[model samples]
Target: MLSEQQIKEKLDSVPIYLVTNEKGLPLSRPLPNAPNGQKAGGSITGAYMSRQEAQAFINELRNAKNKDPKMQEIVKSLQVTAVPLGVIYQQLQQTKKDPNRLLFAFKPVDQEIKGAMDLLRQSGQQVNQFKSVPMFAVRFAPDQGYVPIKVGTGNEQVVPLFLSKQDAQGLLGQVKPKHPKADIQVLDIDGVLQTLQDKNDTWLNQVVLVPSPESREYIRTLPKPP
Candidate 1:
């Protein structure tokens, strides 16, 4: 296992690719390696640090090629945005087991710079040296909000939200219609935590805490969360 400091350094060094295609969706690709024998020859179309930066780049491209209908069509479908490098790394790791994992790759709009492939190869090597885990959030019925709680570990603590008998029953109720034959007799938090811990599955050690949409919004408003 790598130290948190090492992980942080590796993440910082990973190349964030502004991948684009003939589609309206904005996708992020953390380039950990270059394709073998790939020739490097293209113009430096654009480089951006944020969505706003990308939008500005697209605008510049549009103006530069305003006279060409084909180029205009190409520009219309382009989208550019940035995502957390750590998130991309984790998803890529997951893609090894599940091919359905949501990841994308598109042609880089800019020219492949000198030494870029070397950096990518180094980053790819570093990715194999770290441990990554997947996480999920569970919500009780009647509550629009969700809380991230520990999973797998027997020492899971009770989160402040959704710890009532009503809440437990609500969760069961929400699941019952879809799973009519499902025998979910236990609804207590402790029981649920224990069950998750006891499960022998591929996701046993891989699952961790992931916040809900409401929790994320709450976190965003905070200067910092303890």
Candidate 2:
């Protein structure tokens, strides 16, 4: 475990909150240790950070943002939650687990992030089963809408935006030209929620926040790296 001071230093370098607005969807910024490869290169993939790092960063942000009464209220208006990293590692440790049960790569969205967080908490509180899943994995780019690319002319079915792994890559490649200097960092979700709420009451509905058994089953098929 890293000392609080060390954690604070790392947080200081990252954004207090990564905010997405109507302007454009922001991708998670890449970290220094991100894997290298052109075909594998994309700013979003590089932005992945462990839960410990994200939590420490968030605590610092809350402390700072709460200095102002208005900001305090803003912070209060949002909800924040986290799951232990151990659970996620356990899931990762199970190599032979069905491929149908490992869905990590997903589109960013506020509802999806909050839904997963809630499930982790409920499972953890009920039977300590939380640690068996994932520590902290939230939806990214919840606000930035996805851009579609044409793979063939057959007109694939319009089922919910389930971009296959290859399709996801293809779509990302097509849109890379639009954002040359995009910066993404795990910020205080509560802080961003508050800020947006302060501006518009309807901001909360911009993303969906439910996870039915079907969605969970679909999610389990994707790949995730801790």
Candidate 3:
């Protein structure tokens, strides 16, 4: 596992979206335990890795109609809320002692995962059971290394995990001039998670998640969570 500060810095770069009740609390339900599944016993708040995914999920929930009014009432009161992943992580960490604590079920977007799988298969890697959200990075054939993108006036280089394949491809296009064989590679979100927890790679902390431009705009418009 990563240190508290390390996880905090990594998670703060992206916001996790959730469906909240009328009172602004995240909606959660009891989850059953499975051998290889999420943590069991506590109520789980579904956290979306992408804002678009969260909105679409809430839309589906809102449109569904039931024979009884109870379901309808609950559906109508739901809302999409954005919170920094660090915020939730910190809250959960500090409140671990409470028996009535809430858990989170992080839901990754399906299309990105599909894209990641396809890229992996195309790259001659044998990937059959891949479901984690995809993070695209630039790979140069010779060194088999991830290319860092230099940003800002200071020319600070940042290795990024792109949420959208297109954004990664955009970076690839720029790298082609210097390294013609440079291409995009897919890494699962779990890959990054494991990389952090594995240790030994001090530079691993430099790698980060980059949200889609539209998603960034959405997060920018959202009020800062306390």
Candidate 4:
């Protein structure tokens, strides 16, 4: 997690968005086996424009030079990945039936984690230069429950339910043709939560944290913080 200022500094250059699903609905439902025995949440899933369009958008910025190189580098990092819809539904069913196994939940007041999310959201709204591309670093759970996905590994599972059929189809159209073997699944809160927590853990902070420069710099740096 980058400090608020550091995150803001990279905002103009980074393709970041504080996206909310249609009507701010959770993309998936809660798992019945969740530790808290609560319903999973949901979110919207969609396809971003082509990288060519993304590059064009980046180069179009007036302050492109002042932007962070890592910003563009990270944008270039995204790969066309496939998600299985069946897995998504399966997770949802698990959450709905048993919360004990799907025990993930978010404690929004947790400073290190929540603060980062708040800043990311604030940064997204504050920097209009980044507005055109519409990028988002999901602020919800990375992993939880019986099975958990680690944060920052790009292996996390997410189900976006707030998207329209058109948006869903658009996303599938973009990735499916290329990765025919990819599994793209959709689910309610339960499925979303289970997928995130497939590794078995709750509290978003168990997997992520907002590292202030003081804390980050003091700790051994790893090219970048985890």
Candidate 5:
């Protein structure tokens, strides 16, 4: 049996496509002796070897006049781009279902990271300071041009921090020594500012240490300095 780390590594290196059914939900492997012997039940978000194969299947679906409406929606959402096996794995794990072997309009890591950065800038936070803090590296998605964030142990909360392509590479270099696993990276300024703004009983409880009451209050009400 492969260790969790090994399995993760293996999956990270594989190429896979996200598959969805007519209903727009990601497909997973169905139960044994499933109605269709893996074909009769829920769609398998199983990875494909080539874009030609994946697209061919989608085209067939589109050509069928009596196609599923949900399937049609899903097909409309499809993008030719592929994500790393690890990304599909993480999403599958989170949903506790098998891979749908499908892809909806996917967002590239760099694009998402840039958007996150923009969010931080709009919130008037220091982007540079955010990257300086220690964080878990989580997973690396090569095709996406960067590794997105995930929450780590205490003294920190579990939150997703999408890193820029450059920062992702830099982070790998810096964290390889202390964390040969390279599964932790720092959050952007927006993450810290948001953590500070979070109230005690709210759902966004991923901070390692809570900021001071005064600090929290200030962060919550800080005005946009022109």
Candidate 6:
């Protein structure tokens, strides 16, 4: 379980979106087995790891003959809601017994997975598949630790993990002159979360997930709450 403080930090770091109806319930489907392994049914929803993926799902739901009318009804009222992973985590614990509570199944972007695989290969790692969303980190030259940029007038620093390599690239060029050997480090979302739970390294306090420029733009397009 993530600590309350960690959850607060994660609220903005990770960008998780859900396809929801007008009432804001996520698009969900029934599961055959119970979480307790009994013969009961359950409901689960997809957590689109990227905004593009969620919109594509809406497009798929538009196919009349292929999708159920019930699903199509949802598309009529569908909204791509940007949700914080921390909010989900907290709700899950609080609503575990709610019959309609949606179990989240994360769907990573295939294109980003491919990009991550290529980066892994380039970095001397041998792997057939990347199972999680990719995040980019900036590492300072001559140091194994990643770079943490200053946040405020105080001594606080934040190590921003970018959703897009290009977003990280934006930072790299800015720091290049100061640290000529600064380089981007590609990381998987899973590893970063695991580190958040399992590691106590001082720098871990600085970890923050940063959405790409495009992601930020897309977020702004979401309808504001009434």
For model 5, how does the per-residue alpha-carbon lDDT over 54-172 read when each residue is reduced to its tens digit?
66667776677865777666567554344554566455445544433332232223333454455456445637522322222334421222232345464543433322334444556
Model 6: per-residue lDDT, tens digit, 1-226?
A: 4566675567555668899887778878877656676533268888977887788878777755666767655678887888867787677767777665568878766666666677677567868876667888877753566777889999888889887777777888888898888877778776877777776675666677887665778777767668
TM-score of each: 0.27, 0.19, 0.83, 0.19, 0.29, 0.79
**How many times do residue backbones clash in model 5?**
28
Global local distance difference test of model 6: 0.74
The better-scoring model by lDDT among 1 and 2 is 1
Off by over 4 Å in 3: 32-39, 91-100, 223-226
lDDT of 6 at 204: 69
- For each candidate, the alpha-carbon lDDT, in order, equals 0.37, 0.32, 0.78, 0.31, 0.42, 0.74
TM-score of 1: 0.27
Worst ten in a row by lDDT for model 3: 32-41
Off by over 4 Å in 6: 34-41, 95-101, 141-143, 153-155, 176-181, 220-226
Per-residue lDDT for 85-147 in model 1, tens only? 444545455565442334543222122111223223433432222111112123432233333
Task: Write down the lDDT that model 5 would get.
Answer: 0.42
Question: Tens-digit lDDT track for model 4 on 59-144?
Answer: 45423565577545434333332222333334444566442333222211123232333334544433222222211122122232
Query: Which candidate has the top score in lDDT?
Result: 3
Candidate 5 runs further than 4 Å off: 1-3, 20-43, 87-226
> For residues 28-136, could you state the per-residue lDDT of candidate 2 as single tens digits?
3442333452222223311122323333544664678327775565443332222222232334345334433332322233333443445445434323222211212
TM-score of 4: 0.19
Worst 10 residues of 2 by lDDT: 129-138
Residue pairs in steric clash, candidate 3? none
Instruction: Provide the lDDT at 99 for model 4.
Output: 25
